[PDB]
Amino acid sequence: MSLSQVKHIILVLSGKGGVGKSSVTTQLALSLSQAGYSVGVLDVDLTGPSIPRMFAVEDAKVKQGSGGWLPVVVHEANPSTGIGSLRVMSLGFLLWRGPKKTAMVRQFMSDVLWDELDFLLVDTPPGTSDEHISLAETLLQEARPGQLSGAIVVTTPQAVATADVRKELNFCKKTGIRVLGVVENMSGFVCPNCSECTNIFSSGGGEIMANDFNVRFLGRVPIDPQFLVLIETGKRPRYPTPNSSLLVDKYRDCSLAPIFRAITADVVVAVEQ
Amino acid sequence: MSLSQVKHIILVLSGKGGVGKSSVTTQLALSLSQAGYSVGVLDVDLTGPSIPRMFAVEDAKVKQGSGGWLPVVVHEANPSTGIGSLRVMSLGFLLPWRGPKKTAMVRQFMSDVLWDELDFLLVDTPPGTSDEHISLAETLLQEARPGQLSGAIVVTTPQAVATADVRKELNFCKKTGIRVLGVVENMSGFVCPNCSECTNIFSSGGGEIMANDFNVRFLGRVPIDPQFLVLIETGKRPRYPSLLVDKYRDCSLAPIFRAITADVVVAVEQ
Numbered sequence: 187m188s189l190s191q192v193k194h195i196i197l198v199l200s201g202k203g204g205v206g207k208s209s210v211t212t213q214l215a216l217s218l219s220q221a222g223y224s225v226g227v228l229d230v231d232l233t234g235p236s237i238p239r240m241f242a243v244e245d246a247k248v249k250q251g252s253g254g255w256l257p258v259v260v261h262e263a264n265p266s267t268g269i270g271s272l273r274v275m276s277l278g279f280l281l282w283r284g285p286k287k288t289a290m291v292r293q294f295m296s297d298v299l300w301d302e303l304d305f306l307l308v309d310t311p312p313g314t315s316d317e318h319i320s321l322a323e324t325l326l327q328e329a330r331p332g333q334l335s336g337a338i339v340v341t342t343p344q345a346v347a348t349a350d351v352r353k354e355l356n357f358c359k360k361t362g363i364r365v366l367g368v369v370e371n372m373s374g375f376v377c378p379n380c381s382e383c384t385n386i387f388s389s390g391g392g393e394i395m396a397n398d399f400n401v402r403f404l405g406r407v408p409i410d411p412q413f414l415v416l417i418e419t420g421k422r423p424r425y426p427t428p429n430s431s432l433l434v435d436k437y438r439d440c441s442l443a444p445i446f447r448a449i450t451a452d453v454v455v456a457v458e459q
Numbered sequence: 460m461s462l463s464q465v466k467h468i469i470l471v472l473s474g475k476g477g478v479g480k481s482s483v484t485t486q487l488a489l490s491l492s493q494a495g496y497s498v499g500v501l502d503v504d505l506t507g508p509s510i511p512r513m514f515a516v517e518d519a520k521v522k523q524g525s526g527g528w529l530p531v532v533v534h535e536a537n538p539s540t541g542i543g544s545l546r547v548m549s550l551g552f553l554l555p556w557r558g559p560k561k562t563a564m565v566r567q568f569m570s571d572v573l574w575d576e577l578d579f580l581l582v583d584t585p586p587g588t589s590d591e592h593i594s595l596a597e598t599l600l601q602e603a604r605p606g607q608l609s610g611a612i613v614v615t616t617p618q619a620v621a622t623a624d625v626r627k628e629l630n631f632c633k634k635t636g637i638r639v640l641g642v643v644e645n646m647s648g649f650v651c652p653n654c655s656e657c658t659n660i661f662s663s664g665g666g667e668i669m670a671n672d673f674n675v676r677f678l679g680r681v682p683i684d685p686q687f688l689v690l691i692e693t694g695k696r697p698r699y700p701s702l703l704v705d706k707y708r709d710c711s712l713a714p715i716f717r718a719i720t721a722d723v724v725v726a727v728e729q
């Protein structure tokens with residue numbers, strides 16, 4: 187009823203919080219919208235960072251249409267510039283309970299008027315806690331055939347033990363979630379004083395991890411502090427609350443944008459078989 | 460146990476893993492060594508980065524003395540250089556359990572380490588404040604003489620918005636009666652190889668004011684230097700366009716840890 191015209195649903199996964207998985211979701215969304223797709227982002231990771239905060243709409247009023255909730259507009263579609271619309275909904279609008287809280291969460295998600303949508307990215311909570319696993323089942327239960335394109339697993343090179351990406355991958359295999367690929371966030375550094383991107387500790391090992399699972403490796407994302415500034419203050423990056431509709435335009439000046447453009451283009455060829 | 464001649468025991472604490480705690484412990488050890496103190500390091504943090512691997516003694520064969528394990532010598536004292544001996548002992552020396560049994564073995568392992576004469580014993584604890592880890596802290600409190608346990612150093616990250624992490628450590632230190640030597644805000648900024656320019660975009664004093672609001676010492680701010688990692692990994696001296704303790708003198712982090720160490724020493728002996 188709510189997702190009946192959403193073409194592709196992608197879950198953004200993590201075995202542990204603190205990997206910047208909500209940053210990854212934000213930039214996947216912006217990049218897909220820069221490629222001309224209509225993008226939705228559903229945030230059900232109430233522990234992790236606020237996705238509406240990153241889109242500078244954390245103070246927006248969720249409008250109510252006849253029979254549902256209208257997602258918050260980050261920016262409208264723009265044919266002349268070839269960018270698609272971008273809309274967001276947060277579980278924090280609905281919100282200390284047990285199974286009844288799962289039932290309310292499921293009703294709420296089924297109440298969002300997503301309308302036509304090329305891609306709906308889901309910011310899922312980290313880890314496979316019994317509370318989270320049932321929510322993951324809920325999505326699968328309400329998903330329709332062919333719709334769930336699969337999952338994107340976000341990790342870091344820094345993790346000595348990959349038991350959480352091993353865990354999230356194993357859960358995906360166990361439940362049939364297709365793994366579209368793994369993203370290695372915070373692998374290297376881009377900085378303002380000069381554009382040189384460096385990771386002298388190159389072997390983050392996340393790629394061999396992707397080999398061990400015969401699973402796709404979408405690429406490495408460096409830290410760019412000008413991205414965090416852009417999200418926080420709205421300042422456009424330069425290389426030697428903010429207005430939300432300007433974000434996608436300022437993002438193509440961020441050094442991370444060409445990286446996510448390539449990650450996006452490969453995610454799209456994977457989902458479209 | 461066998462703390463019979465350990466003058467000062469410092470706990471390095473953390474609300475959660477991945478904050479660079481084991482590396483902070485590593486550099487406190489090197490700095491205390493460069494200041495002429497004999498130093499031991501007890502790694503009881505299995506989930507974190509292997510501290511033996513940091514000191515480049517991960518392939519050592521630990522020996523058995525008089526009813527217990529003998530610590531591995533990273534380097535011995537050198538009065539000429541003014542550096543002191545540096546020993547490490549970790550579980551990763553002896554493993555190629557979960558639940559209460561895991562912590563039982565870890566408590567028994569701690570009991571079985573023969574430390575002998577020592578100015579400072581640094582203890583790399585597992586993060587968090589679970590009841591298991593509390594039991595580890597309680598054991599140390601019992602085997603420690605009234606002046607022996609100097610206090611706890613709490614490592615935190617400015618990027619993390621979970622300040623309460625800090626709080627549950629200093630609440631727990633005050634609940635167990637463990638002095639708080641200070642807070643170290645790690646991963647605060649980033650030094651770069653292409654030029655020694657440190658970049659930091661967080662509050663630039665947010666950890667300072669938060670430690671003031673808690674009435675706890677603020678020991679200082681430590682940025683990320685990837686050349687420290689390549690030195691730990693390949694022995695390459697950090698350049699900024701023999702022994703680890705001496706090569707580390709060329710790492711930008713070393714003057715930072717000289718000042719932090721010095722403040723800790725003043726706090727300890729008063």
Ligand code: SF4
Nearest residue numbers: 377379380651653654
């Ligand atoms: S400008 Fe270049 S050399 Fe300076 S910190 Fe940034 S990356 Fe490093």
